[PDB]
PDB file of all heavy atoms in Angstrom:
ATOM      1  N   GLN O  66     -17.266   6.276  -8.287  1.00 63.96           N
ATOM      2  CA  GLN O  66     -18.544   5.814  -7.795  1.00 63.96           C
ATOM      3  C   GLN O  66     -18.919   4.584  -8.625  1.00 63.96           C
ATOM      4  O   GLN O  66     -18.732   4.538  -9.851  1.00 63.96           O
ATOM      5  CB  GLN O  66     -19.624   6.830  -7.942  1.00 63.96           C
ATOM      6  CG  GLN O  66     -19.391   8.116  -7.179  1.00 63.96           C
ATOM      7  CD  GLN O  66     -20.572   9.071  -7.253  1.00 63.96           C
ATOM      8  OE1 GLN O  66     -20.966   9.474  -8.323  1.00 63.96           O
ATOM      9  NE2 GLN O  66     -21.110   9.411  -6.079  1.00 63.96           N
ATOM     10  N   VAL O  67     -19.420   3.512  -7.943  1.00 63.75           N
ATOM     11  CA  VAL O  67     -19.804   2.322  -8.642  1.00 63.75           C
ATOM     12  C   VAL O  67     -21.209   1.952  -8.225  1.00 63.75           C
ATOM     13  O   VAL O  67     -21.541   2.133  -7.029  1.00 63.75           O
ATOM     14  CB  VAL O  67     -18.881   1.128  -8.285  1.00 63.75           C
ATOM     15  CG1 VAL O  67     -19.358  -0.079  -9.041  1.00 63.75           C
ATOM     16  CG2 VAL O  67     -17.418   1.496  -8.642  1.00 63.75           C
ATOM     17  N   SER O  68     -22.008   1.572  -9.180  1.00 62.55           N
ATOM     18  CA  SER O  68     -23.409   1.210  -8.876  1.00 62.55           C
ATOM     19  C   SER O  68     -23.821   0.070  -9.813  1.00 62.55           C
ATOM     20  O   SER O  68     -23.219  -0.185 -10.861  1.00 62.55           O
ATOM     21  CB  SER O  68     -24.317   2.430  -9.099  1.00 62.55           C
ATOM     22  OG  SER O  68     -24.224   2.904 -10.416  1.00 62.55           O
ATOM     23  N   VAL O  69     -24.809  -0.657  -9.377  1.00 62.20           N
ATOM     24  CA  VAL O  69     -25.368  -1.749 -10.151  1.00 62.20           C
ATOM     25  C   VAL O  69     -26.833  -1.479 -10.339  1.00 62.20           C
ATOM     26  O   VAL O  69     -27.637  -1.601  -9.371  1.00 62.20           O
ATOM     27  CB  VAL O  69     -25.130  -3.100  -9.411  1.00 62.20           C
ATOM     28  CG1 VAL O  69     -25.830  -4.205 -10.144  1.00 62.20           C
ATOM     29  CG2 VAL O  69     -23.663  -3.359  -9.244  1.00 62.20           C
ATOM     30  N   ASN O  70     -27.195  -1.072 -11.537  1.00 58.99           N
ATOM     31  CA  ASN O  70     -28.591  -0.757 -11.853  1.00 58.99           C
ATOM     32  C   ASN O  70     -29.186   0.252 -10.879  1.00 58.99           C
ATOM     33  O   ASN O  70     -30.248   0.070 -10.293  1.00 58.99           O
ATOM     34  CB  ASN O  70     -29.424  -2.073 -11.836  1.00 58.99           C
ATOM     35  CG  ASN O  70     -29.086  -2.936 -13.009  1.00 58.99           C
ATOM     36  OD1 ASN O  70     -29.130  -4.189 -12.870  1.00 58.99           O
ATOM     37  ND2 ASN O  70     -28.794  -2.371 -14.133  1.00 58.99           N
ATOM     38  N   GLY O  71     -28.419   1.343 -10.748  1.00 59.64           N
ATOM     39  CA  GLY O  71     -28.882   2.454  -9.854  1.00 59.64           C
ATOM     40  C   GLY O  71     -28.517   2.355  -8.402  1.00 59.64           C
ATOM     41  O   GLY O  71     -28.565   3.306  -7.656  1.00 59.64           O
ATOM     42  N   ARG O  72     -28.215   1.133  -7.935  1.00 58.04           N
ATOM     43  CA  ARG O  72     -27.852   0.880  -6.525  1.00 58.04           C
ATOM     44  C   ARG O  72     -26.366   0.984  -6.251  1.00 58.04           C
ATOM     45  O   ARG O  72     -25.607   0.237  -6.767  1.00 58.04           O
ATOM     46  CB  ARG O  72     -28.362  -0.522  -6.115  1.00 58.04           C
ATOM     47  CG  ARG O  72     -28.062  -0.810  -4.624  1.00 58.04           C
ATOM     48  N   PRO O  73     -25.983   1.981  -5.467  1.00 55.85           N
ATOM     49  CA  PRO O  73     -24.570   2.236  -5.118  1.00 55.85           C
ATOM     50  C   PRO O  73     -23.938   1.084  -4.411  1.00 55.85           C
ATOM     51  O   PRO O  73     -24.518   0.487  -3.452  1.00 55.85           O
ATOM     52  CB  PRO O  73     -24.685   3.495  -4.246  1.00 55.85           C
ATOM     53  CG  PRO O  73     -25.907   4.221  -4.788  1.00 55.85           C
ATOM     54  CD  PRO O  73     -26.852   2.996  -4.802  1.00 55.85           C
ATOM     55  N   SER O  74     -22.726   0.697  -4.797  1.00 54.05           N
ATOM     56  CA  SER O  74     -21.985  -0.385  -4.169  1.00 54.05           C
ATOM     57  C   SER O  74     -21.125   0.200  -3.035  1.00 54.05           C
ATOM     58  O   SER O  74     -20.754   1.374  -3.134  1.00 54.05           O
ATOM     59  CB  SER O  74     -21.063  -1.094  -5.202  1.00 54.05           C
ATOM     60  OG  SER O  74     -21.779  -1.701  -6.246  1.00 54.05           O
ATOM     61  N   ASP O  75     -20.781  -0.568  -2.063  1.00 54.34           N
ATOM     62  CA  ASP O  75     -19.946  -0.145  -1.015  1.00 54.34           C
ATOM     63  C   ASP O  75     -18.501  -0.161  -1.537  1.00 54.34           C
ATOM     64  O   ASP O  75     -18.091  -1.135  -2.214  1.00 54.34           O
ATOM     65  CB  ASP O  75     -20.048  -1.100   0.220  1.00 54.34           C
ATOM     66  CG  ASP O  75     -19.300  -0.603   1.428  1.00 54.34           C
ATOM     67  OD1 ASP O  75     -19.554   0.553   1.807  1.00 54.34           O
ATOM     68  OD2 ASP O  75     -18.490  -1.376   2.008  1.00 54.34           O
ATOM     69  N   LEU O  76     -17.710   0.901  -1.237  1.00 56.13           N
ATOM     70  CA  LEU O  76     -16.376   0.990  -1.765  1.00 56.13           C
ATOM     71  C   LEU O  76     -15.237   0.835  -0.743  1.00 56.13           C
ATOM     72  O   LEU O  76     -15.447   1.115   0.478  1.00 56.13           O
ATOM     73  CB  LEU O  76     -16.167   2.349  -2.461  1.00 56.13           C
ATOM     74  CG  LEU O  76     -17.107   2.779  -3.621  1.00 56.13           C
ATOM     75  CD1 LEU O  76     -16.706   4.128  -4.140  1.00 56.13           C
ATOM     76  CD2 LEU O  76     -17.062   1.750  -4.743  1.00 56.13           C
ATOM     77  N   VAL O  77     -14.089   0.383  -1.150  1.00 58.04           N
ATOM     78  CA  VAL O  77     -12.893   0.219  -0.376  1.00 58.04           C
ATOM     79  C   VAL O  77     -11.839   0.859  -1.224  1.00 58.04           C
ATOM     80  O   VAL O  77     -11.849   0.713  -2.450  1.00 58.04           O
ATOM     81  CB  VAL O  77     -12.530  -1.199  -0.078  1.00 58.04           C
ATOM     82  CG1 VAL O  77     -13.658  -1.895   0.707  1.00 58.04           C
ATOM     83  CG2 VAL O  77     -12.273  -1.990  -1.362  1.00 58.04           C
ATOM     84  N   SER O  78     -10.907   1.625  -0.608  1.00 55.35           N
ATOM     85  CA  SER O  78      -9.839   2.259  -1.426  1.00 55.35           C
ATOM     86  C   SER O  78      -8.603   2.583  -0.633  1.00 55.35           C
ATOM     87  O   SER O  78      -8.589   2.582   0.571  1.00 55.35           O
ATOM     88  CB  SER O  78     -10.411   3.517  -2.040  1.00 55.35           C
ATOM     89  OG  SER O  78     -10.877   4.409  -1.019  1.00 55.35           O
ATOM     90  N   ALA O  79      -7.519   2.931  -1.365  1.00 53.84           N
ATOM     91  CA  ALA O  79      -6.260   3.341  -0.772  1.00 53.84           C
ATOM     92  C   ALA O  79      -5.413   3.855  -1.933  1.00 53.84           C
ATOM     93  O   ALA O  79      -5.661   3.604  -3.090  1.00 53.84           O
ATOM     94  CB  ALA O  79      -5.598   2.134  -0.116  1.00 53.84           C
ATOM     95  N   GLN O  80      -4.368   4.597  -1.557  1.00 54.29           N
ATOM     96  CA  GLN O  80      -3.407   5.108  -2.553  1.00 54.29           C
ATOM     97  C   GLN O  80      -2.037   4.612  -2.094  1.00 54.29           C
ATOM     98  O   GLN O  80      -1.723   4.587  -0.928  1.00 54.29           O
ATOM     99  CB  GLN O  80      -3.397   6.653  -2.528  1.00 54.29           C
ATOM    100  CG  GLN O  80      -2.489   7.269  -3.606  1.00 54.29           C
ATOM    101  CD  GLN O  80      -2.412   8.765  -3.503  1.00 54.29           C
ATOM    102  OE1 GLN O  80      -3.342   9.433  -3.127  1.00 54.29           O
ATOM    103  NE2 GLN O  80      -1.237   9.310  -3.928  1.00 54.29           N
TER     104      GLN O  80
END
Side-chain angles (χ1 to χ4, degrees), chain O residues 66-71 73-80:
Chain O
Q66 298 186 302
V67 180
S68 57
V69 175
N70 290 144
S74 298
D75 187 52
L76 305 180
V77 298
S78 59
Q80 184 185 327

